[PDB]
Amino acid sequence: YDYLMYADIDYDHPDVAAEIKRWGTWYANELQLDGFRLDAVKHIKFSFLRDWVNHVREKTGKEMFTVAEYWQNDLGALENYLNKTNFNHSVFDVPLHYQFHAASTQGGGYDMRKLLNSTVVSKHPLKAVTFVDNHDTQPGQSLESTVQTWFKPLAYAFILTRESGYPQVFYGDMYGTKGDSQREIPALKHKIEPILKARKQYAYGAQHDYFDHHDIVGWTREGDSSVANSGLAALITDGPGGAKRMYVGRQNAGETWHDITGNRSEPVVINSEGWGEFHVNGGSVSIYVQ
Template sequence: MRNLLRSFTYCTLVLLTASCMQDANEELEVKNYWPEAGITYEIFIQSFYDTDGDGIGDINGVTKKLDHVQELGANAIWFMPLMPSPSYHKYDVTDYKAIHPDYGTMDDFKQMLDEAHKRDIKVVIDMIINHTSDEHPWFQEAKKGRDNPYRDYYVWAQYDTIQDYLDKKVVTLDSDNIRQWHDPGQGDDYYYGFFTGDMPDLNFDNPKVREEIYEIGRYWLAEVGVDGFRLDAAKHIYPDDRAADSHEFWEEFRAEMEKVKPDVYLVGEVYDMKEVVAPYLTGLRALFNFDFHYTLLEAYKKEDGMLLAKKQHDILAFYNGITDDFIDATISSNHDQPRLLNELGKSKDKLKQAIAILMTMPGAPYIYYGEEIGMLGKKPDPNIREPFLWDVAEQDEGRTKWITPAFSTDNTVTPLAIQKEDADSYFNHYKRVIQLRNTHPALAIGSLELPAEKYPKAVMAYQRKTGEQELYVFHNLGKKSVEIPLPQGFDREVYHLKGAKVNGDKIKLPAFSSIVLGK
């Protein structure tokens, strides 16, 4: 039965679930819209697939599972940190030009990169340059004294000039660290570490530091061959009151990287409101849209369909006022937020619709590993990063064991191998909506237009338009079925979810259903 189902074509699978009204005989062109509107799959190697039996995922495991990424329909992979580090998460680097030994070797990485590129899958790596580990050789030298040549690689201040800062307790949007200045235990000087004392911030006023960072970027682009970087903590290169200096740095960084690779992909983590985020776009062409994630959750909570559509429309208009050369990296979850299924009250219907919303909205969507099989997870962070379930436990040779999962277990999550046999599974739903996006230019790269018509509060409605295609999208985020007028000229059902359908001159939208209409 498993082999039979795996041999079904996409359209056959769609017809089995009655989720798409596209003619099964019509040939649709599958396009790769990356980076402008392509789909990126985020992987935490530690939890992905283990090939050497040590319980920790490795790069060879990613190589073995590249076909999974390709089957899902993703165009790129973003790897969470893979450089040597003393922590499990590896956001505190000790060597910027190496692979963590738990994950493998640089040769393993280059082989994986070659295999990914053969499949037309781009590779983006996490670049953590706001800070290093306190075990990094630079910091070990810097601690030796004020005259050490590496002292000025970090930010220092004398005790009596920063007492107010030592005493204050500031909780920011993206860090709950209550003390930013830290005592190395070697005198009156304190060093700055925005996140923790284990992560001392680099001093980007020092030209030597900038050149070190540029050289690291050149190495990964030119010598290793990656396609780009995800820039961690991009907002914190300088303090908030020096935001203009941060903007200037990222413009300089981009210029240096484009000298090596003109089409380098740079996506930044700037966690704030759009007015703060937008100025970074001149340096970092892509920025994560955290508002998308949180507004989507708020829309479900309030059963307010247009909340997200209006928010997204406003953000895109605002960004276009800064530059028309930007990429809106939309997310429904990532490694820092509780798993989406938990956020949605473990509702299968809501999760499926949420992904249909993500894939029919503008932007370049990111998928966090495991979301496609409905993995679960809540804070603390390690439990949001639990092992991927490839098969039932007794047959899952590659399942990692570095942590005992508290949320994603065989009792709570159906493994991928089983989901592949189920036409109604999360995995096959993800494949369908990704395929829908990749075969309809309007959904990938079209404009976002909001309707003049008024619909029931729970209904989200928007049009997506390109010169060659025009689609109308409706989602009912409410618990009750609603019926709305069929918009004039849109009488062709392209896709529907959970029983949404055209009925004469009306559209019937059951709870948590969606429909895409064409002309």
């Protein structure tokens, strides 16, 4: 209960606003920082935050990418905040995290098609930092709402291989969390690495969404000329496994693709027209690349 003794900073006070703005530049210069993560922006004067971000970039002459934590599972509040701040910085996609959580706790009962709506990334793809879990949602934390482990890799494939949003990987998910509950996140490193690889060398080109099923949904990336062998076909399932015919671009017709996650051994050959029939196991994820 030590937090009860903290004091809330007053930004209507000229000296306080001038001081935080100045410290901001000092912090940036002392550490040679490239950007910021804004904490608890919900309780801070919106105009100040907008001015502080402008100030720091101006005094440094640097881009200073900035992402603010406006914790509200509501697209309306976040959108207002973006407007009040002149879209000068991104926000964490809180709604998306909450759907991931919901999908993971409903054991197949969730409508996967819902993932496509009500998220910052759906409305403002260039102003969204998508994440699966963080330090406030992990087991035992103030905003606890951990995405169940089985669903975790599916959530990561979603934020890392789709064209929209600036994805964020969590340390606790990679190396596991060191709390003392029986619900700690284990080190999923070995399961996220393949998805990171896919983002790194394959998630390029036009995207084709196939959110036409209550459980099995997917999407493709046609690849791009600038990145060799790029292109992919991702499929994730809430419940039962299955298959889906997806278009990957007539440009890569005749290729044999394989599940980079290794959950599936069977290769998929792209037909003359650029289509493929991909497969995914139940409560699993499959990312086919060439």
